[PDB]
PDB file of C-alpha atoms in Angstrom:
ATOM      1  CA  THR A 101       9.127   0.326  -3.192  1.00 38.19           C
ATOM      2  CA  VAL A 102       7.852  -3.025  -4.557  1.00 41.48           C
ATOM      3  CA  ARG A 103       6.546  -1.380  -7.784  1.00 44.35           C
ATOM      4  CA  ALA A 104       9.893   0.310  -8.544  1.00 43.36           C
ATOM      5  CA  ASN A 105      12.237  -2.420  -7.100  1.00 39.63           C
ATOM      6  CA  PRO A 106      15.149   0.095  -6.927  1.00 39.36           C
ATOM      7  CA  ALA A 107      18.640  -1.471  -7.267  1.00 37.71           C
ATOM      8  CA  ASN A 108      16.906  -4.908  -7.095  1.00 39.63           C
ATOM      9  CA  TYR A 109      16.509  -4.386  -3.307  1.00 38.67           C
ATOM     10  CA  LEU A 110      13.886  -7.168  -3.007  1.00 37.62           C
ATOM     11  CA  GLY A 111      16.085  -9.782  -4.742  1.00 39.01           C
ATOM     12  CA  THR A 112      19.137  -8.622  -2.760  1.00 40.88           C
ATOM     13  CA  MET A 113      17.314  -9.001   0.598  1.00 40.25           C
ATOM     14  CA  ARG A 114      16.453 -12.646  -0.248  1.00 40.50           C
ATOM     15  CA  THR A 115      20.206 -13.291  -0.688  1.00 39.81           C
ATOM     16  CA  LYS A 116      21.310 -11.319   2.438  1.00 38.93           C
ATOM     17  CA  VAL A 117      18.849 -13.103   4.786  1.00 39.22           C
ATOM     18  CA  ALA A 118      20.207 -16.527   3.744  1.00 38.55           C
ATOM     19  CA  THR A 119      23.756 -15.439   4.670  1.00 37.97           C
ATOM     20  CA  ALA A 120      22.431 -13.965   7.948  1.00 42.58           C
ATOM     21  CA  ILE A 121      20.931 -17.408   8.756  1.00 43.10           C
ATOM     22  CA  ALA A 122      24.241 -19.163   7.932  1.00 46.10           C
ATOM     23  CA  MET A 123      26.181 -16.655  10.115  1.00 46.42           C
ATOM     24  CA  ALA A 124      23.635 -17.133  12.917  1.00 46.31           C
ATOM     25  CA  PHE A 125      24.270 -20.903  12.920  1.00 48.83           C
ATOM     26  CA  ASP A 126      28.090 -20.455  12.958  1.00 50.94           C
ATOM     27  CA  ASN A 127      28.022 -17.917  15.821  1.00 48.52           C
ATOM     28  CA  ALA A 128      25.641 -20.133  17.840  1.00 47.21           C
ATOM     29  CA  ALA A 129      27.890 -23.198  17.344  1.00 48.69           C
ATOM     30  CA  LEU A 130      31.301 -21.517  17.919  1.00 48.54           C
ATOM     31  CA  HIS A 131      30.732 -18.653  20.395  1.00 49.93           C
ATOM     32  CA  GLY A 132      27.206 -19.471  21.690  1.00 46.03           C
ATOM     33  CA  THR A 133      26.121 -15.815  21.156  1.00 43.19           C
ATOM     34  CA  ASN A 134      22.278 -16.054  20.928  1.00 43.98           C
ATOM     35  CA  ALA A 135      21.957 -19.856  20.763  1.00 45.22           C
ATOM     36  CA  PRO A 136      18.581 -21.590  21.296  1.00 46.95           C
ATOM     37  CA  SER A 137      18.192 -23.730  24.456  1.00 45.53           C
ATOM     38  CA  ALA A 138      17.874 -26.833  22.211  1.00 48.97           C
ATOM     39  CA  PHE A 139      21.524 -26.616  20.986  1.00 50.27           C
ATOM     40  CA  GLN A 140      23.739 -28.784  23.226  1.00 48.98           C
ATOM     41  CA  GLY A 141      27.089 -27.023  23.820  1.00 49.71           C
ATOM     42  CA  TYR A 142      29.347 -24.606  21.866  1.00 45.97           C
ATOM     43  CA  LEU A 143      33.142 -24.645  21.301  1.00 47.40           C
ATOM     44  CA  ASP A 144      33.969 -21.531  23.356  1.00 48.60           C
ATOM     45  CA  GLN A 145      32.943 -23.555  26.506  1.00 47.61           C
ATOM     46  CA  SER A 146      36.261 -25.521  26.455  1.00 49.04           C
ATOM     47  CA  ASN A 147      38.508 -25.147  29.536  1.00 52.55           C
ATOM     48  CA  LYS A 148      41.670 -25.324  27.283  1.00 54.64           C
ATOM     49  CA  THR A 149      43.439 -22.291  25.746  1.00 58.87           C
TER      50      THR A 149
ATOM     51  CA  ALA B  51     -48.680  -2.125 -13.929  1.00 56.72           C
ATOM     52  CA  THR B  52     -46.858  -3.126 -10.672  1.00 58.71           C
ATOM     53  CA  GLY B  53     -45.010   0.232 -10.473  1.00 61.61           C
ATOM     54  CA  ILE B  54     -41.287   1.092 -10.113  1.00 62.05           C
ATOM     55  CA  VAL B  55     -38.767   1.424  -7.212  1.00 58.32           C
ATOM     56  CA  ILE B  56     -35.920   3.991  -7.414  1.00 58.21           C
ATOM     57  CA  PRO B  57     -32.932   3.757  -4.969  1.00 58.21           C
ATOM     58  CA  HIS B  58     -32.212   7.503  -4.504  1.00 59.69           C
ATOM     59  CA  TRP B  59     -28.596   8.147  -3.354  1.00 60.73           C
ATOM     60  CA  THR B  60     -27.942  10.534  -0.395  1.00 58.61           C
ATOM     61  CA  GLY B  61     -24.484   9.626   1.041  1.00 56.48           C
ATOM     62  CA  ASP B  62     -21.320  11.776   1.173  1.00 55.09           C
ATOM     63  CA  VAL B  63     -18.714   9.258  -0.093  1.00 51.42           C
ATOM     64  CA  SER B  64     -15.128  10.473   0.591  1.00 54.22           C
ATOM     65  CA  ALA B  65     -11.423   9.944  -0.232  1.00 53.10           C
ATOM     66  CA  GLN B  66      -8.156  11.480   1.071  1.00 53.54           C
ATOM     67  CA  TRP B  67      -4.714  12.435  -0.203  1.00 52.47           C
ATOM     68  CA  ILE B  68      -2.309  10.017   1.432  1.00 52.17           C
ATOM     69  CA  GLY B  69       1.494   9.560   1.746  1.00 50.73           C
ATOM     70  CA  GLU B  70       3.541   6.365   1.277  1.00 51.35           C
ATOM     71  CA  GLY B  71       2.719   4.019   4.182  1.00 50.67           C
ATOM     72  CA  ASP B  72      -0.030   6.296   5.659  1.00 49.36           C
ATOM     73  CA  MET B  73      -3.330   4.771   6.911  1.00 46.97           C
ATOM     74  CA  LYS B  74      -6.392   4.770   4.602  1.00 46.45           C
ATOM     75  CA  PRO B  75      -9.787   6.039   5.877  1.00 45.80           C
ATOM     76  CA  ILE B  76     -13.003   3.946   5.875  1.00 45.55           C
ATOM     77  CA  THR B  77     -16.319   5.232   4.371  1.00 45.98           C
ATOM     78  CA  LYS B  78     -19.999   4.263   3.802  1.00 45.52           C
ATOM     79  CA  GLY B  79     -22.761   5.267   1.333  1.00 44.61           C
ATOM     80  CA  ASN B  80     -26.434   6.133   1.959  1.00 44.41           C
ATOM     81  CA  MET B  81     -29.754   5.560   0.088  1.00 41.82           C
ATOM     82  CA  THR B  82     -33.561   6.020   0.238  1.00 39.21           C
ATOM     83  CA  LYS B  83     -35.976   3.874  -1.818  1.00 38.76           C
ATOM     84  CA  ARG B  84     -38.835   5.783  -3.565  1.00 41.14           C
ATOM     85  CA  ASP B  85     -41.805   4.065  -5.300  1.00 40.19           C
ATOM     86  CA  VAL B  86     -44.190   4.971  -8.181  1.00 41.92           C
ATOM     87  CA  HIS B  87     -47.661   3.366  -8.683  1.00 44.81           C
ATOM     88  CA  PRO B  88     -49.767   3.908 -11.883  1.00 46.23           C
ATOM     89  CA  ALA B  89     -53.274   5.491 -11.783  1.00 43.35           C
ATOM     90  CA  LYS B  90     -56.232   5.267 -14.241  1.00 43.50           C
ATOM     91  CA  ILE B  91     -57.715   8.137 -16.170  1.00 43.62           C
ATOM     92  CA  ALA B  92     -60.948   7.259 -17.974  1.00 45.00           C
ATOM     93  CA  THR B  93     -64.194   8.542 -19.608  1.00 43.25           C
ATOM     94  CA  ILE B  94     -67.395   7.228 -21.347  1.00 44.08           C
ATOM     95  CA  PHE B  95     -69.372   8.708 -24.290  1.00 47.19           C
ATOM     96  CA  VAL B  96     -72.813   7.576 -25.546  1.00 47.41           C
ATOM     97  CA  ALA B  97     -74.785   7.781 -28.840  1.00 45.43           C
ATOM     98  CA  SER B  98     -78.000   6.311 -30.363  1.00 43.51           C
ATOM     99  CA  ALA B  99     -77.531   3.303 -32.691  1.00 42.84           C
ATOM    100  CA  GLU B 100     -78.933   5.464 -35.551  1.00 46.17           C
TER     101      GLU B 100
ATOM    102  CA  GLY C   2       2.377   6.259   8.835  1.00 44.52           C
ATOM    103  CA  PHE C   3       6.088   6.638   9.386  1.00 43.87           C
ATOM    104  CA  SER C   4       9.241   8.797   9.266  1.00 45.14           C
ATOM    105  CA  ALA C   5      11.601   8.687   6.300  1.00 41.99           C
ATOM    106  CA  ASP C   6      14.474   6.276   7.195  1.00 44.03           C
ATOM    107  CA  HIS C   7      12.154   4.380   9.593  1.00 44.69           C
ATOM    108  CA  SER C   8      14.001   1.502  11.308  1.00 42.30           C
ATOM    109  CA  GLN C   9      11.651  -1.360  10.216  1.00 42.90           C
ATOM    110  CA  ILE C  10       9.914  -0.353   6.906  1.00 41.63           C
ATOM    111  CA  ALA C  11      11.523   0.291   3.477  1.00 39.14           C
ATOM    112  CA  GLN C  12      10.075   3.318   1.602  1.00 40.67           C
ATOM    113  CA  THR C  13      10.882   5.368  -1.563  1.00 41.75           C
ATOM    114  CA  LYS C  14      11.140   8.294   0.934  1.00 43.66           C
ATOM    115  CA  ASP C  15      14.269   6.639   2.385  1.00 42.76           C
ATOM    116  CA  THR C  16      17.715   8.186   1.720  1.00 43.48           C
ATOM    117  CA  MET C  17      19.185   4.768   0.773  1.00 41.12           C
ATOM    118  CA  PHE C  18      17.251   4.960  -2.564  1.00 38.86           C
ATOM    119  CA  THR C  19      18.674   8.391  -3.592  1.00 38.50           C
ATOM    120  CA  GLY C  20      19.368   8.413  -7.367  1.00 40.72           C
ATOM    121  CA  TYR C  21      17.301   5.259  -8.184  1.00 39.07           C
ATOM    122  CA  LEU C  22      14.037   7.238  -8.557  1.00 37.94           C
ATOM    123  CA  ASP C  23      15.052   9.735 -11.289  1.00 37.46           C
ATOM    124  CA  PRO C  24      12.204  11.646 -13.062  1.00 41.76           C
ATOM    125  CA  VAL C  25      11.597  11.376 -16.828  1.00 42.24           C
ATOM    126  CA  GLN C  26      12.462  14.523 -18.879  1.00 44.53           C
ATOM    127  CA  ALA C  27       9.715  16.359 -20.828  1.00 43.66           C
ATOM    128  CA  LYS C  28       8.935  19.306 -23.188  1.00 45.76           C
ATOM    129  CA  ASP C  29       8.570  22.882 -21.827  1.00 44.88           C
ATOM    130  CA  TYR C  30       4.764  22.739 -21.450  1.00 47.16           C
ATOM    131  CA  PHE C  31       4.620  26.265 -19.920  1.00 44.08           C
ATOM    132  CA  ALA C  32       5.838  27.926 -23.155  1.00 45.18           C
ATOM    133  CA  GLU C  33       3.175  29.710 -25.235  1.00 43.70           C
ATOM    134  CA  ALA C  34       3.014  29.158 -29.019  1.00 47.25           C
ATOM    135  CA  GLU C  35       6.071  30.954 -30.444  1.00 48.16           C
ATOM    136  CA  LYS C  36       5.635  34.706 -31.176  1.00 46.31           C
ATOM    137  CA  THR C  37       5.651  35.356 -34.925  1.00 48.28           C
ATOM    138  CA  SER C  38       5.924  39.028 -36.008  1.00 49.81           C
ATOM    139  CA  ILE C  39       2.562  40.862 -36.142  1.00 47.21           C
ATOM    140  CA  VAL C  40       3.571  43.197 -39.031  1.00 44.50           C
ATOM    141  CA  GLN C  41       4.084  40.104 -41.233  1.00 46.57           C
ATOM    142  CA  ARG C  42       0.442  39.066 -40.468  1.00 48.91           C
ATOM    143  CA  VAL C  43      -1.076  42.343 -41.858  1.00 45.55           C
ATOM    144  CA  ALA C  44       1.454  43.680 -44.429  1.00 45.17           C
ATOM    145  CA  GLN C  45       1.725  42.202 -47.959  1.00 45.92           C
ATOM    146  CA  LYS C  46       4.481  39.578 -48.501  1.00 44.53           C
ATOM    147  CA  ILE C  47       6.225  39.782 -51.925  1.00 44.98           C
ATOM    148  CA  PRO C  48       8.888  37.763 -53.843  1.00 45.35           C
ATOM    149  CA  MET C  49      12.422  39.160 -53.325  1.00 47.26           C
ATOM    150  CA  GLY C  50      16.098  38.444 -54.210  1.00 47.16           C
TER     151      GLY C  50
ATOM    152  CA  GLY D 250      15.244 -26.281   3.713  1.00 45.57           C
ATOM    153  CA  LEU D 251      15.132 -22.460   3.768  1.00 43.52           C
ATOM    154  CA  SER D 252      11.608 -21.268   2.875  1.00 42.07           C
ATOM    155  CA  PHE D 253       9.906 -18.000   1.795  1.00 41.77           C
ATOM    156  CA  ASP D 254       6.365 -16.561   1.957  1.00 44.82           C
ATOM    157  CA  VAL D 255       5.063 -13.155   0.741  1.00 46.90           C
ATOM    158  CA  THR D 256       1.923 -11.305   1.904  1.00 46.03           C
ATOM    159  CA  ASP D 257       0.081  -8.047   1.240  1.00 44.47           C
ATOM    160  CA  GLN D 258      -2.719  -8.448   3.848  1.00 42.54           C
ATOM    161  CA  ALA D 259      -1.389  -9.979   7.071  1.00 40.04           C
ATOM    162  CA  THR D 260      -1.008  -7.786  10.219  1.00 37.96           C
ATOM    163  CA  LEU D 261       2.289  -7.268  12.069  1.00 37.97           C
ATOM    164  CA  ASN D 262       3.145  -6.243  15.616  1.00 38.35           C
ATOM    165  CA  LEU D 263       5.956  -3.654  15.281  1.00 37.50           C
ATOM    166  CA  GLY D 264       6.357  -3.628  19.122  1.00 38.77           C
ATOM    167  CA  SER D 265       6.596  -6.737  21.373  1.00 38.00           C
ATOM    168  CA  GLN D 266       4.085  -9.400  22.525  1.00 32.30           C
ATOM    169  CA  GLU D 267       3.991  -7.718  25.996  1.00 31.51           C
ATOM    170  CA  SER D 268       3.626  -4.182  24.463  1.00 31.83           C
ATOM    171  CA  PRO D 269       1.782  -4.310  21.101  1.00 30.17           C
ATOM    172  CA  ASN D 270       1.899  -1.818  18.211  1.00 34.96           C
ATOM    173  CA  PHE D 271      -0.138  -3.332  15.356  1.00 33.06           C
ATOM    174  CA  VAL D 272       0.017  -2.262  11.687  1.00 33.81           C
ATOM    175  CA  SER D 273      -2.270  -3.606   8.951  1.00 34.23           C
ATOM    176  CA  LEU D 274      -0.267  -4.364   5.800  1.00 33.71           C
ATOM    177  CA  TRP D 275      -3.475  -3.715   3.805  1.00 36.61           C
ATOM    178  CA  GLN D 276      -4.751  -0.450   5.358  1.00 34.59           C
ATOM    179  CA  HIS D 277      -1.302   1.082   5.080  1.00 35.51           C
ATOM    180  CA  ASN D 278       0.051   0.143   1.592  1.00 38.30           C
ATOM    181  CA  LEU D 279       2.656  -2.497   2.591  1.00 39.02           C
ATOM    182  CA  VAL D 280       4.057  -5.885   1.462  1.00 37.36           C
ATOM    183  CA  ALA D 281       6.038  -8.279   3.694  1.00 37.16           C
ATOM    184  CA  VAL D 282       8.337 -11.269   2.989  1.00 37.96           C
ATOM    185  CA  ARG D 283       8.753 -13.949   5.702  1.00 34.71           C
ATOM    186  CA  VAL D 284      11.734 -16.369   5.745  1.00 37.06           C
ATOM    187  CA  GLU D 285      12.186 -19.477   7.900  1.00 35.81           C
ATOM    188  CA  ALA D 286      14.693 -22.372   8.386  1.00 38.94           C
ATOM    189  CA  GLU D 287      15.385 -25.115  11.006  1.00 37.21           C
ATOM    190  CA  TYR D 288      18.661 -26.597  12.416  1.00 39.12           C
ATOM    191  CA  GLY D 289      19.843 -29.025  15.154  1.00 36.03           C
ATOM    192  CA  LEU D 290      23.322 -29.240  16.784  1.00 36.29           C
ATOM    193  CA  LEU D 291      25.047 -31.532  19.304  1.00 35.54           C
ATOM    194  CA  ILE D 292      28.632 -31.292  20.569  1.00 36.33           C
ATOM    195  CA  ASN D 293      29.434 -34.523  22.421  1.00 36.21           C
ATOM    196  CA  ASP D 294      32.314 -33.195  24.610  1.00 34.47           C
ATOM    197  CA  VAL D 295      33.148 -29.458  24.603  1.00 37.30           C
ATOM    198  CA  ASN D 296      36.481 -30.128  26.396  1.00 40.77           C
ATOM    199  CA  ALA D 297      37.830 -31.963  23.257  1.00 35.98           C
ATOM    200  CA  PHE D 298      38.969 -28.600  21.698  1.00 36.96           C
TER     201      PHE D 298
ATOM    202  CA  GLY E 250      -5.935   4.400 -13.802  1.00 34.71           C
ATOM    203  CA  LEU E 251      -8.446   3.982 -10.927  1.00 35.90           C
ATOM    204  CA  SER E 252      -7.699   0.634  -9.185  1.00 37.83           C
ATOM    205  CA  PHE E 253      -9.644  -1.765  -6.893  1.00 36.02           C
ATOM    206  CA  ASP E 254      -8.630  -4.646  -4.534  1.00 34.19           C
ATOM    207  CA  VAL E 255     -10.950  -6.834  -2.381  1.00 37.58           C
ATOM    208  CA  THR E 256     -10.219  -8.877   0.778  1.00 38.76           C
ATOM    209  CA  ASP E 257     -11.964 -11.140   3.278  1.00 38.17           C
ATOM    210  CA  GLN E 258      -8.718 -11.757   5.249  1.00 42.04           C
ATOM    211  CA  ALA E 259      -7.321  -8.353   6.298  1.00 44.17           C
ATOM    212  CA  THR E 260      -7.578  -6.677   9.723  1.00 43.54           C
ATOM    213  CA  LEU E 261      -8.579  -2.992   9.789  1.00 45.72           C
ATOM    214  CA  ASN E 262      -8.223  -0.195  12.326  1.00 44.93           C
ATOM    215  CA  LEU E 263     -11.555   1.681  12.676  1.00 45.87           C
ATOM    216  CA  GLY E 264      -9.975   4.268  15.053  1.00 43.81           C
ATOM    217  CA  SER E 265      -6.675   6.115  14.427  1.00 45.41           C
ATOM    218  CA  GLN E 266      -2.921   5.607  15.112  1.00 48.16           C
ATOM    219  CA  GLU E 267      -3.338   7.545  18.419  1.00 47.44           C
ATOM    220  CA  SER E 268      -6.343   5.388  19.617  1.00 49.72           C
ATOM    221  CA  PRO E 269      -6.644   2.028  17.785  1.00 47.69           C
ATOM    222  CA  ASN E 270      -9.799  -0.073  17.366  1.00 46.81           C
ATOM    223  CA  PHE E 271      -9.113  -3.207  15.294  1.00 48.45           C
ATOM    224  CA  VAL E 272     -11.613  -5.602  13.638  1.00 50.22           C
ATOM    225  CA  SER E 273     -10.678  -8.869  11.891  1.00 50.11           C
ATOM    226  CA  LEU E 274     -12.645  -9.149   8.638  1.00 52.33           C
ATOM    227  CA  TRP E 275     -12.196 -12.938   8.636  1.00 52.74           C
ATOM    228  CA  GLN E 276     -13.437 -13.553  12.200  1.00 51.98           C
ATOM    229  CA  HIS E 277     -16.474 -11.242  11.690  1.00 50.45           C
ATOM    230  CA  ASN E 278     -17.416 -12.652   8.218  1.00 49.45           C
ATOM    231  CA  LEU E 279     -16.915  -9.201   6.571  1.00 50.99           C
ATOM    232  CA  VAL E 280     -15.548  -8.134   3.132  1.00 51.27           C
ATOM    233  CA  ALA E 281     -13.635  -4.919   2.300  1.00 52.07           C
ATOM    234  CA  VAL E 282     -12.804  -3.070  -0.961  1.00 50.24           C
ATOM    235  CA  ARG E 283      -9.735  -0.801  -1.277  1.00 49.76           C
ATOM    236  CA  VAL E 284      -9.870   1.983  -3.897  1.00 48.27           C
ATOM    237  CA  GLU E 285      -6.762   3.802  -5.172  1.00 50.22           C
ATOM    238  CA  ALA E 286      -5.716   6.421  -7.758  1.00 49.96           C
ATOM    239  CA  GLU E 287      -2.552   8.477  -8.284  1.00 50.90           C
ATOM    240  CA  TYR E 288      -2.132  12.008  -9.726  1.00 54.11           C
ATOM    241  CA  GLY E 289       0.433  14.791 -10.240  1.00 54.54           C
ATOM    242  CA  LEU E 290      -0.160  18.581 -10.358  1.00 54.87           C
ATOM    243  CA  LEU E 291       2.014  21.672 -10.878  1.00 55.41           C
ATOM    244  CA  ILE E 292       1.066  25.356 -11.089  1.00 55.08           C
ATOM    245  CA  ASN E 293       3.945  27.267 -12.728  1.00 53.50           C
ATOM    246  CA  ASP E 294       3.215  30.671 -11.123  1.00 52.09           C
ATOM    247  CA  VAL E 295       0.456  31.039  -8.476  1.00 52.69           C
ATOM    248  CA  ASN E 296       0.648  34.869  -8.797  1.00 51.42           C
ATOM    249  CA  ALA E 297      -0.961  34.576 -12.303  1.00 49.15           C
ATOM    250  CA  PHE E 298      -4.589  34.320 -10.958  1.00 47.56           C
TER     251      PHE E 298
END
């Protein structure tokens, strides 16, 4: 798969993982989905709706 | 004059047809050293000085 | 040593690469040398109009 | 910042640390790319939203 | 053509996928050589022999 690099899969992965890391940070900060114990609070904790 | 050493091969080295992402086998050779030492062959012959 | 479409490893076996791995086209190697007529190999050829 | 490494001879656990399933990237014909980044977040008062 | 790679860093399985037995080349001060070639074959009609 590396020798052929079909559809530039290897270059495309290195773009998609960077977006996955940006989306992971947003979801951890807004909705607290999978957040690390070192992050202090997330917006969905508010008692106001 | 010291002689010769020959490393005679005796091992069944091997290789296998293998798919994408299959595991490769491990193999080892084998040898036996053989040695050759020279020997003299000689003779004398004699005659009168006349 | 894995299935096609394995969940963790990308392979040329995988269905997601269908149509990126197209063979090169070649001559018909299984054809014999073309059959000339055997009478023309033994009979005498002459000029004609 | 976001950082990348590539390897053709590390070893990976395809299972979990409690239940291993090791694969050699060299004894099978594999290549792996590893990507890593690092973030910190504080929200001072989650009831301000 | 016939191809060769050498490593002092890999880990190898000396057993099989059903009964593993790993050895680290680097921790045991060993060296390994990986040999590879690649071929294609077709027989047009097996009933011809």
